[PDB]
């Protein structure tokens with residue numbers, strides 16, 4: 001889990017033909033701006049306690065049937 | 071290599087200068103501005119005849135031209151049994167010329183550095199990173215035990231520590247025993263991990279003008295001027311070549327045969 | 342050249358093949374059609390890697406290409422310590438093959454000839470006239486003891502006797518002790534008076550396809566076929582190169598170091 | 613050292629400690645919920 005703090009940049013979100021403008025932040029309307037993804041390069045170093053044999057496998061896939069009441 | 075036992079009473083042999091001149095080749099490296107100022111298409115032949123007056127057989131003296139120090143520093147290829155490099159002095163290139171000397175006045179055992187896959191460190195004082203190309207911009211990011219970076223982020227090349235920019239040759243010396251992430255323009259640069267084995271005896275560098283600024287050793291406490299680092303004041307290139315020709319015996323005396331067994335791929339001009 | 346005294350009980354040294362490969366180099370000469378049929382942009386690299394499997398360090402084996410026998414015959418320069426020339430067999434170019442083999446398998450001591458000014462004669466059987474260039478056309482007019490042509494007119498060059506026409510390399514062997522007037526196209530080919538000193542032990546010629554037709558001696562009574570003149574059958578060039586690589590040990594065994602001291606400074610590779 | 617090493621810092625009969633150092637290209641995306 002990589003955590004990011006935020007600093008608003010020069011572009012300002014505003015609803016055209018409306019009385020809301022010069023407002024800083026990033027709305028949830030179209031955050032992606034049509035981009036297929038936001039790419040950031042990272043590097044991580046960690047120490048993990050793992051079984052000695054490199055043949056064991058933790059379950060990865062799932063079969064989820066939660067929120068039956070929902 | 072075997073022990074050599076010699077008696078201090080042994081008689082001196084006759085001068086071997088004539089024999090070595092007869093059985094060896096001399097390479098002279100000069101800047102193109104020398105040819106420009108001389109302005110003669112037969113000056114090679116004239117210098118060859120003068121060297122013949124000095125003793126060298128016709129055709130044993132090879133004249134090689136380089137545009138400038140920066141261009142010459144891109145993988146210099148020294149061919150003859152004896153190499154003399156007439157290096158013009160520039161106050162703005164004191165390091166660069168020094169670097170060039172450090173590359174041609176010493177023997178280097180070099181291996182490739184594929185920095186994209188490995189993080190490299192310098193094990194001892196002899197180890198350096200020699201980068202050569204058209205444009206060598208080398209940024210360094212020292213790493214820690216977790217290989218993450220000190221004062222630098224491995225991912226962000228902007229935060230890296232700048233050690234070279236737009237260089238044709240650069241010798242990089244970082245702190246030993248520390249792994250560094252390296253960012254170099256591999257398209258226009260090749261970086262090699264090199265160990266200096268010792269002096270290269272068959273290469274002499276004559277600095278044309280200026281003062282003593284050469285430092286072929288990274289150690290700040292030593293700036294040794296070997297006999298192969300000459301320096302002559304000048305105003306005309308014809309005088310420079312005349313003094314090179316006249317004192318050729320002195321120049322060769324300061325030089326010795328290479329004596330190293332190589333494994334690389336370079337042509338040579340030999341008799 | 343001092344006498345060497347040896348005992349018939351001295352213990353054999355170990356094989357020098359490994360150190361010889363590590364300290365020598367191999368130049369392989371092939372025709373253009375070889376690379377044309379191979380049709381690969383890195384066959385040199387894979388051949389070098391195969392040679393490394395055979396022992397030779399990387400960058401030691403050199404690959405030189407020539408258009409054909411005739412073009413290669415014009416002043417061939419052999420660089421490496423060991424040279425192997427793959428010569429394709431053409432039934433119509435037997436004498437040209439023999440002349441190339443004679444030139445590169447033997448050591449020659451040559452001097453210039455001024456055919457315009459002085460008459461020339463061949464002292465002994467080891468003396469020949471080697472003419473090479475873009476096009477060599479040599480006509481000969483033998484003279485008598487009164488320097489008058491025999492069956493030819495000194496003034497009229499049409500009466501001369503034609504011994505070469507449009508050749509790129511030709512070895513002329515005329516009757517010894519007779520002075521000849523030579524008409525040579527000096528504007529397109531140079532003729533040199535040469536003496537055969539001995540064999541060139543660092544040059545092997547592999548005749549690709551054909552039969553044994555090489556004759557490196559002007560004597561009609563000798564067709565030596567020395568151990569440095571190999572012959573192989575072929576259909577594909579890749580098989581030829583694989584045979585050369587696999588048996589490079591035998592090929593080098595058939596060759597010895599040049600051992601001749603040269604008074605001319607030329608370009609070579611030497612590791 | 614390498615950009616993608618797999619180092620060992622301890623090992624036992626059934627368990628071990630693996631030090632993984634890796635470069636990654638985190639490609640993420642936003643999801644917007646619209647209720648009208």
Ligand SMILES: *[C@@H]1O[C@H](CO)[C@@H](O)[C@H](O)[C@H]1NC(C)=O
Pocket residue numbers: 084
């Ligand atoms: C050395 O020089 C001396 C004095 O000229 C001369 O007599 C001698 O022959 C030369 N050669 C040798 C091998 O001593």
Ligand SMILES: *[C@@H]1O[C@H](CO)[C@@H](O)[C@H](O)[C@H]1NC(C)=O
Pocket residue numbers: 355
């Ligand atoms: C030579 O070969 C022998 C036997 O294979 C081996 O013991 C020895 O170390 C080799 N080298 C020398 C210098 O004898």
Ligand SMILES: [Ca+2]
Pocket residue numbers: 165166169237238239240
């Ligand atoms: Ca520099």
Ligand SMILES: [Ca+2]
Pocket residue numbers: 221222229230231
């Ligand atoms: Ca920084």
Ligand SMILES: [Ca+2]
Pocket residue numbers: 192194195197243244245246
């Ligand atoms: Ca260092």
Ligand SMILES: [Ca+2]
Pocket residue numbers: 285286287288289290291292293
């Ligand atoms: Ca220093």
Ligand SMILES: [Ca+2]
Pocket residue numbers: 436437440508509510511
């Ligand atoms: Ca011919």
Ligand SMILES: [Ca+2]
Pocket residue numbers: 492493494499500501502
């Ligand atoms: Ca006639």
Ligand SMILES: [Ca+2]
Pocket residue numbers: 463465466468514515516517
């Ligand atoms: Ca003859």
Ligand SMILES: [Ca+2]
Pocket residue numbers: 556557558559560561562563564
């Ligand atoms: Ca014969």
